[PDB]
Amino acid sequence: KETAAAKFERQHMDSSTSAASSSNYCNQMMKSRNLTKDRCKPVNTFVHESLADVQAVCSQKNVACKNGQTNCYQSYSTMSITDCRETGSSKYPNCAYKTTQANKHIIVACEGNPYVPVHFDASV
């Protein structure tokens, strides 16, 4: 099994780097995190912050999730994020990604006891 909360960290957390290191970053991380095992996950975002920092977002600004549910929260501060979007030459099993670093507010769905992030919703 893999808890909702550990799957979030596996898919979205990357505190070991402060930014998108190189153009190689996405191809490497997407595969590394097993995001390219059943298909090429089209898009994925990695947050370069500490796990305490991202968890604290569950107590920040409450906003509507893209799905209409209401358990989403927006971060008061912008965080360092790396955006990975699948290219055109990307053909499974050879998935390809364009790495894109930025600093934006993250929106995450939170749930549970403790109330921890379980889904990345967006960034603005």
Side-chain angles (χ1 to χ4, degrees), residues 2-124:
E2 188 181 45
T3 57
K7 169 172 194 173
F8 176 83
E9 322 183 6
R10 169 173 69 81
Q11 308 195 106
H12 298 294
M13 287 306 293
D14 182 32
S15 320
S16 328
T17 66
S18 64
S21 21
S22 54
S23 44
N24 269 331
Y25 180 81
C26 285
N27 299 331
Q28 300 163 323
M29 285 291 282
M30 287 305 274
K31 195 175 168 194
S32 222
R33 295 306 178 81
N34 276 306
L35 300 180
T36 60
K37 185 185 196 178
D38 283 8
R39 56 186 278 257
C40 305
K41 179 173 188 180
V43 83
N44 190 72
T45 296
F46 280 104
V47 182
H48 304 299
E49 302 283 340
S50 58
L51 180 63
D53 270 12
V54 177
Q55 288 170 157
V57 176
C58 295
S59 61
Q60 303 189 13
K61 192 187 195 184
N62 181 232
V63 300
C65 300
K66 276 170 159 167
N67 72 357
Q69 267 194 264
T70 48
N71 59 319
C72 279
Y73 302 81
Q74 195 182 296
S75 77
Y76 290 124
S77 280
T78 44
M79 306 195 154
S80 188
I81 61 165
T82 299
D83 194 67
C84 300
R85 299 179 177 275
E86 164 172 55
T87 60
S89 78
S90 186
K91 274 305 156 189
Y92 178 94
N94 300 117
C95 308
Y97 302 87
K98 162 182 56 74
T99 290
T100 301
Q101 173 68 207
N103 267 267
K104 317 173 88 194
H105 297 275
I106 67 175
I107 296 170
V108 290
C110 300
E111 35 175 55
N113 182 38
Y115 207 58
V116 300
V118 301
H119 139 81
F120 191 97
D121 210 50
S123 59
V124 286

